[PDB]
């Protein structure tokens, strides 16, 4: 049983960060070094584990979360970061054990005129908790008056478009991100 990371890393479609995907992987064997040695990743940052060992450490289930952000936001997908993404979209715990892997996806995920498909959350009444998801699209009440389903003054659509344009600077081009979270408990994933 080889772990199906192929379905995660090489999927034809990803997600907006606000609606980040999780694939739960357990009961399988995987070659982490096949991943670690791939030249196709521009970022591969790990916390609590080295890429060259992963084949040897076992774990009780791994969660693989995935989404799309801009290049200049990849630094927010790390422990202890702040910002719109970490605060209102996808927060990592302080005690994160695992890796953050990103690569430029401009060739796949950009569209002439701007992509309208990928969104991020602009506003929320409070910061997200670690590994929380919020997929509501309720009109945001910024003032003293209920919106009752109508957008306008102090009644804001909570999502903003990334508008990924093929001609964007690398900082503003789309990057695909996979976060591997390793959990230990009783009794799995293991190497060859």
């Amino acid at each position: 049983n080889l772990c199906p990371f192929g379905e995660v890393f090489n999927a034809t479609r990803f997600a907006s960060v606000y609606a980040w995907n999780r694939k739960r992987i357990s009961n399988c064997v995987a070659d982490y070094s096949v991943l670690y040695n791939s030249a196709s990743f521009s970022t591969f940052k790990c916390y609590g584990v080295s890429p060259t060992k992963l084949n040897d450490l076992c774990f009780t289930n791994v969660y693989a979360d995935s989404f799309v952000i801009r290049g200049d936001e990849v630094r927010q997908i790390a422990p202890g970061q702040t910002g719109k993404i970490a605060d209102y979209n996808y927060k990592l715990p302080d005690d994160f054990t695992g890796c953050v892997i990103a690569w430029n996806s401009n060739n796949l995920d950009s569209k002439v005129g701007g992509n309208y498909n990928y969104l991020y959350r602009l506003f929320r009444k409070s910061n997200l908790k670690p590994f929380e998801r919020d997929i509501s699209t309720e009109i945001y009440q910024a003032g003293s008056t209920p919106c009752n389903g109508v957008e306008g003054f102090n009644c804001y659509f909570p999502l903003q478009s990334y508008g990924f344009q093929p001609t964007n600077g690398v900082g503003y081009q789309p990057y695909r991100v996979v976060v591997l979270s390793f959990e230990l408990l009783h009794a799995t994933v293991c190497g060859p």
């Epitope: 009444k125 910024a142 804001y156 508008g163």
Partner: antibody, heavy 121, light 108 residues
Framework: EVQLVQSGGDLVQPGGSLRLSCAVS????????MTWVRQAPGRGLEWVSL???????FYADSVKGRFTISRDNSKNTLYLQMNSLRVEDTAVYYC???????????????WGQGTLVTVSS | DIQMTQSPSALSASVGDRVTITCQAS??????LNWYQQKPGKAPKLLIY???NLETGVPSRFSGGGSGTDFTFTISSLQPEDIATYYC?????????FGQGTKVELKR
């Protein structure tokens, strides 16, 4: 309508401290973006700090550590804590909310009346 | 930081002349550039947001455009009520920065 009022500024000394107030009428402060900007004596405009609606706050590369930004949701008022004041911080100060441009909506930014702050001893 | 270089420092023109101010960024800021107008001793106001779009109430004679590093501002026909000091401001790459400013001046 919408209005912002700034107060609590006067002469201080090097190493002193001063709190700036910015009352708001029209929108809830705790649920909206907000920033402070610095208008030097007869010179350009300078960004000081911002606070995301939800807690997170960010400062300039000079007021960092020396300054702080906060808010009180009851009185619905904004506050700028300026500690270890230098002369280089002597200027006018403005409180404003970030412009909006979600989906099929767009609105400008609202600014306060501005308060003068002097550090010279 | 992303420094913003705005030209010209001083500008004097007559009524009806088209005026083009400029603001370059040291790094790509995409379309997240706002142009502000400040009249002598008063709070600045937002005219052009998202580097091109006009805010409500802004006359059609104001227009701007650009994406990336170089950014352009322009009034097609100068009006006496347009005499002020204009600044460029990026707001997507923290820390936020402004421009030095351009003082529009009438020509007698």
């Amino acid at each position: 309508e919408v209005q912002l009022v700034q107060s609590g500024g006067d002469l201080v000394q090097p190493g002193g401290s001063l709190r700036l107030s910015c009352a708001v009428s029209g929108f809830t402060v705790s649920r909206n973006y907000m920033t402070w900007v610095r208008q030097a004596p007869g010179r350009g405009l300078e960004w000081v700090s911002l606070i995301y609606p939800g807690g997170s706050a960010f400062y300039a590369d000079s007021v960092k550590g020396r300054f702080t930004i906060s808010r009180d949701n009851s009185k619905n008022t904004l506050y700028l804590q300026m500690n270890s004041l230098r002369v280089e911080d002597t200027a006018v100060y403005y409180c404003a909310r970030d412009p909006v441009s979600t989906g099929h909506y767009h609105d400008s930014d609202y600014w306060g009346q501005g308060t003068l702050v002097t550090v010279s001893s | 930081d992303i420094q913003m270089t705005q030209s010209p420092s001083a500008l004097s023109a007559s009524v009806g002349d088209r005026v083009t101010i400029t603001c370059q960024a040291s790094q790509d800021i995409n379309k997240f550039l706002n142009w502000y107008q400040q009249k002598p001793g008063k709070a600045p106001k937002l005219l052009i947001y998202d580097a091109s779009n006009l805010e409500t109430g802004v006359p059609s004679r104001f227009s701007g455009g650009g994406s990336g590093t170089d950014f352009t501002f322009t009034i097609s026909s100068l009006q006496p009520e347009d005499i002020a000091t204009y600044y460029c401001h990026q707001y997507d790459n923290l820390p936020r920065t402004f421009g030095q400013g351009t003082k529009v001046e009438l020509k007698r």
